[PDB]
């Protein structure tokens, strides 16, 4: 009996994150839905390299929403570039709902497991992944008649517990009943992040500005006043050294305050704007002429 | 097929308006600072939002009308005050021309 | 020549098919059943639909501007909130329930006493909307309404059925206790599409029992 192991990684290429998250920003109201390209290398992971959009259709995330022309047209035209990969998968967002497949999404992945038992079918949530988390979940049905056997009927392997643990917010909708997630592995290599890093990467000109002096000084000025009157409070606390159990007076007045935290962490802040900004002065006085 | 040519035009309109989506309208409450408001929603809860950059700052003073986008739920455009004969008061009758 | 403007036609006849079936895909149902309030200039529309919950359009969608007036009532997609097609208002059913023509012929023989008070009707109404010409060749402008006050049972529903009765006339009735619905925008649209009736047909009285209702 063939079976998924948990050790079995969804490879998807860094341009897949940016297009499928851009897809599913792009309509982020409704329900996005497209095709992935990629390659059943092996048993053992599915690598999918590309992806291109499904146009928006009134019926939504479903089978009908497919349209076989433009999948066809698309993929005879994508062939001729330079890319002859396989229907790999499909993917559909689901704005603010989370990850986790509908019983309309659980037929339109039966009828994607039909060409191939290997079809994929992952969701991204544009909502959520707002921030440096990408809440990006890969599922695959599990059949119904497999219920004589192990569920996830995965083999020896340690993986499966690694990477996450499966969501409260998925679990209820269906997980290790109806489908299975696949741990996700993000094929990120160099060449690719080299070319991602100029998002914000300055330039030459930064790290020689001079910031501007009057700014300079009007915050150089509050952070020392700060300071002094961070200082009275140090003072007060210190040549307090009040001793009934003062290893229990260092933990009932802990609330992030004089002591330390905005102690020295300032001077920490200003010291490094100081020496930063007089180094970069005398660079260019020294460069310049 | 210059009549086909424009109703064409106002088709392919109709097809950029289909990917275009709705803002909920919003009344902006107080100014936090540069890039912070309190925005409530005509019938809704009330959003810690921010402002789009091309948008003037000062516009946006307490009592704006503005139109936020409704999933990153960002200030995109001010809107002029509401006009409605709400008005339970007598200023709307107009004394007549004599 | 003319085989290339056929040509022309028929490449553009199957742009205009595959738009066309684009945006029959994208129409599809449901349509939020929404209200227009109003329309900014700055092509953009802000909408209240039915679920008591506004949402300004940047773009008006697939109808044309013009046609759009404030208070027209349309249909929008559930999710994006866009203006699909405008949708026939016909004065709903209820409305075209109130135009009722079995008028029980409250003759001005089965109202007694309430003499001075017909006559004033009658100079009211009657000619101003029978022999209007004199009317407008005076400058006598005729009220638009009358206000039948007066203690209870003392017979304003059977005088507003009677000037209804011998002085044909459509009679509109429009009753103010019927005019509270708890739905939201009920009663409102429900005066609107009254008056629009009663702008719609020949000559005829919209009639209000017991304005109180609405009043207060
Ligand atoms: N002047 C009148 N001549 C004949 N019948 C009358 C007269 N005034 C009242 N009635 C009769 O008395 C009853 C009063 O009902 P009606 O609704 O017509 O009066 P109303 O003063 O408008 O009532 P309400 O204020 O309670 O709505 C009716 O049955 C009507 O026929
Ligand atoms: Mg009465
Ligand atoms: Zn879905």
């Given at each position: ?19 499928m ?61 330079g890319?002859?990969?396989?229907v ?27 060409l ?10 544009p ?24 569920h ?14 499966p ?8 997980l290790n009943?109806?489908?299975y997630?696949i ?29 501007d ?26 040549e307090?050294?009040?001793?009934m ?45 | ?11 392919e ?17 107080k ?40 999933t ?27 | ?80 909130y ?63 309404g ?48 009254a ?22």
């Amino acid at each position: 009996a063939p079976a998924v192991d948990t050790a079995e990684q969804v490879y998807i290429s860094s341009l897949a994150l940016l297009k499928m998250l851009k897809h599913g920003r792009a309509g982020v109201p409704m329900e996005v839905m497209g095709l992935m390209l990629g390659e059943f290398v092996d048993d053992y992971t599915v690598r999918v390299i590309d992806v291109f959009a499904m146009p928006q259709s009134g019926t939504g995330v479903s089978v009908e929403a497919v349209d076989p022309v433009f999948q066809a047209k698309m993929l005879d035209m994508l062939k001729q570039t330079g890319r002859p990969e396989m229907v790999v998968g499909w993917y559909h967002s689901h704005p603010g709902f989370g990850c986790w497949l509908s019983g309309v999404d659980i037929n339109t992945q039966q009828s994607f497991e039909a060409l191939s038992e290997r079809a994929v079918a992952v969701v991204v949530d544009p909502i959520q992944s707002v921030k440096g988390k990408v809440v990006i979940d890969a599922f695959r049905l599990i059949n119904a008649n497999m219920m004589v056997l192990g569920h996830e009927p995965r083999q020896t392997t340690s993986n499966l517990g690694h990477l996450n643990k499966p969501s409260i917010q998925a679990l209820i909708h269906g997980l290790n009943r109806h489908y299975y997630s696949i741990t996700i592995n993000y094929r990120k290599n160099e060449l690719e992040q080299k070319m991602l890093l100029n998002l914000h990467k300055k330039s030459w000109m930064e790290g020689l500005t001079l910031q501007d002096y009057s700014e300079h000084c009007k915050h150089n000025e509050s952070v020392v006043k700060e300071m002094l009157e961070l200082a009275k409070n140090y003072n007060k606390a210190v040549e307090e050294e009040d001793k009934m159990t003062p290893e229990q007076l260092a933990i009932k007045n802990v609330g992030k305050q004089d002591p330390k935290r905005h102690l020295e962490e300032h001077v920490d802040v200003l010291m490094t704007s100081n020496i930063v900004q007089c180094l970069a002065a005398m660079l260019d006085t020294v460069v310049f002429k | 097929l210059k009549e086909l040519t424009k109703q064409y035009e106002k088709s392919e309109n109709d097809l950029k308006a289909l990917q275009s989506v709705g803002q909920i309208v919003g009344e902006v409450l107080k100014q936090l600072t540069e890039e912070k408001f309190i925005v409530k929603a005509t019938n809704g809860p009330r959003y810690v939002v921010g402002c789009r950059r091309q948008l003037d700052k000062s516009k946006l003073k307490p009592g704006t009308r503005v139109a936020l986008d409704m999933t990153t739920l960002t200030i995109m455009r001010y809107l002029p005050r509401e006009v409605d004969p709400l008005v339970y008061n007598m200023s709307h009758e107009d004394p007549g021309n004599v | 020549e003319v085989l290339r403007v056929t040509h022309e036609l028929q490449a553009m006849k199957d742009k205009i098919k595959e738009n066309s079936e684009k945006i029959k895909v994208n129409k599809t149902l449901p349509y939020l059943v929404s209200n227009v309030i109003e329309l900014l200039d700055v092509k953009c529309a802000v909408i209240k639909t039915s679920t008591r919950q506004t949402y300004f359009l940047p773009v008006i969608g697939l109808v044309d501007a013009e046609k759009l007036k404030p208070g027209d009532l349309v249909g929008v997609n559930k999710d994006s909130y866009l203006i699909l097609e405008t949708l026939p208002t016909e004065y709903d059913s209820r409305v075209k329930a109130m135009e009722v023509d079995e008028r029980p012929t409250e003759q001005y023989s089965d109202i007694g006493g309430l003499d001075k008070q017909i006559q004033e009707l009658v100079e009211a109404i009657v000619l101003p909307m029978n022999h209007k010409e004199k009317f407008e060749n005076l400058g006598i402008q005729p009220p638009k309404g009358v206000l039948m006050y007066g203690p209870p049972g003392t017979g304003k529903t059977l005088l507003a059925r009677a000037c209804a009765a011998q002085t044909k006339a459509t009679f509109l009735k429009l009753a103010g206790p019927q005019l509270v619905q708890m739905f939201i925008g009920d009663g409102a649209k429900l005066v609107r599409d009254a008056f629009a009736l009663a702008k719609e047909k020949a000559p005829s009285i919209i009639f209000i029992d017991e304005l109180d209702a609405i009043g207060t």
